[PDB]
Automatic annotation (TrEMBL):
The chain holds residues 32 to 443 of 1099 of the full protein. GO terms for molecular function: identical protein binding; metal ion binding. It comes from the Bacteria. The gene is sbsC. The lineage of its organism: Bacteria, Bacillati, Bacillota, Bacilli, Bacillales. This is Surface layer protein. Keywords: Calcium, Metal-binding, Signal, Zinc.
Length: 412
């Protein structure tokens, strides 16, 4: 009833509300029921308001000092707009505890979505929870007590971050896959390739939760991206003096990969060579074209392809592509080592190196003939079993580049 006592008590009640959470955090390392804290919060507000009315009535010459005192205690312990450190302790705690338990609930809701393998629900929650973690963690900063701020982060926040982080690959590939689809469906192949590149970058890192669905999504994006590409002739290159290699950017309908659809001209002249046969890669996108006519060393040839179609539908554009035929010039030949392994069939071509005059190794475009102390099979295999030496001679046919007779040890 007396004013001094009323204000004395209302201040005690305001602090009591802060003790409601702070004491239990400190004593037990736990949080109170938030509802007890709300109850204490409301008692303090009512204690405040009642104390004000009593002071307005019977405070006399201390009226203003009383209201300021009350206000100061209120603003520190219970509530204040835009709190600084140590202010609005109860209201900041409530907000942070509520922020933190919403995190926990969202985390648990996310876990349910991955447990139920629901990609769309997990995607939504990942974004919502990401937003909470980034934009609203400042709520935690306004809490009074390093000890209790740390209790909020460890208790609730750390788990939520961990679930979110763990899912980033899953959500990225789902997003990029559909961005890819949407890009091709929108006639934008640069956008689709770039989206697809990301897919490919991350899909080997998705978790188990949605792996099949996500791998499926990624395969659908790849395939849908290929479809939009135009089948192209990429290149031609000589092989020997009567054949050349053609490369496709996309497997070719083998029924269109026939001689009549290939034209070969000695470039800049009217001399035209006839295709004999076309032999396609089951591998899809490369064929060997064999000519009746012979290619001249050092000449350039233009290959005009027409009438080719895809492994499924689309037409290659008539295309012009050249290659130049060069028959290498063997200058030297040597055996790679002073020895051969002990085996019943050693291929001598694997043991010998041929170079041109500049000393560059000539990998193809020449024939090898051998003589040996040992019987030769297929012109190149020898049996070294039970032998400690053998004699061999590699000559590049039918030039005069040759090893001469060389005695090689047999040892592994």
């Amino acid at each position: 009833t007396d004013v001094a006592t009323v204000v004395s008590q209302a201040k005690a009640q305001m602090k009591e509300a802060y003790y409601t959470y702070s004491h239990t955090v400190t004593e037990t390392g736990q949080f109170p029921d938030i509802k007890d804290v709300y109850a204490a919060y409301n008692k303090a507000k009512q204690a405040y308001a009642n104390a004000v009315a009593v002071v307005n009535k019977a405070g006399g010459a201390k009226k203003d000092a009383y209201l300021a005192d009350l206000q100061a205690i209120y603003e520190t312990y219970v509530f204040k707009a835009n709190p600084k450190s140590g202010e609005a302790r109860v209201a900041t705690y409530i907000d942070a505890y509520n922020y933190a338990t919403k995190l926990d609930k969202m985390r648990q809701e996310l876990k349910a979505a991955v447990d139920a393998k629901d990609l769309k629900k997990a995607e939504e929650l990942y974004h919502k929870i990401s937003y909470e973690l980034k934009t609203r963690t400042v709520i935690l900063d306004r809490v009074y007590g390093q000890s209790t701020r740390e209790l909020l982060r460890s208790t609730f926040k750390a788990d939520a971050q961990a679930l979110r982080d763990r899912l980033i690959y899953d959500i990225t590939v789902a997003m990029k896959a559909r961005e890819a689809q949407d890009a091709v469906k929108a006639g934008n192949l640069d956008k689709a390739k770039a989206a697809l590149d990301q897919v490919n970058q991350y899909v080997s890192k998705v978790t188990d939760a949605f792996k099949a669905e996500l791998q499926k999504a990624a395969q659908d994006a790849k395939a849908a991206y290929e479809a939009a590409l135009t089948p192209k002739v990429e290149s031609v290159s000589a092989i020997d003096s009567t054949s050349f290699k053609v490369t496709f950017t996309k497997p070719v309908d083998k029924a269109t990969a026939i001689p009549k659809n290939f034209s070969i001209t000695l470039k800049g002249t009217e001399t035209k060579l006839y295709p004999k046969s076309v032999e396609v890669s089951e591998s899809g996108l490369t064929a060997t074209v064999t000519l009746y006519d012979t290619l001249v060393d050092g000449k350039t040839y233009t290959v005009v392809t027409s009438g080719l179609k895809d492994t499924a539908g689309k037409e290659f554009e008539t295309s012009t592509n050249e290659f130049t035929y060069n028959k290498p010039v063997p200058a030297s030949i040597t055996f790679n080592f002073n020895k051969l392994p002990e085996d019943s069939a050693v291929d001598l071509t694997k043991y010998v190196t041929v170079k041109d005059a500049a000393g560059n190794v000539i990998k193809s475009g020449f024939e090898l003939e051998f003589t040996s102390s040992e019987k030769l099979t297929q012109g190149k295999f020898i049996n070294t079993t039970g032998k400690k030496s053998v004699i061999v001679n590699a000559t590049v046919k039918g030039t005069n580049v040759t090893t001469g007779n060389v005695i090689l040890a047999v040892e592994d």
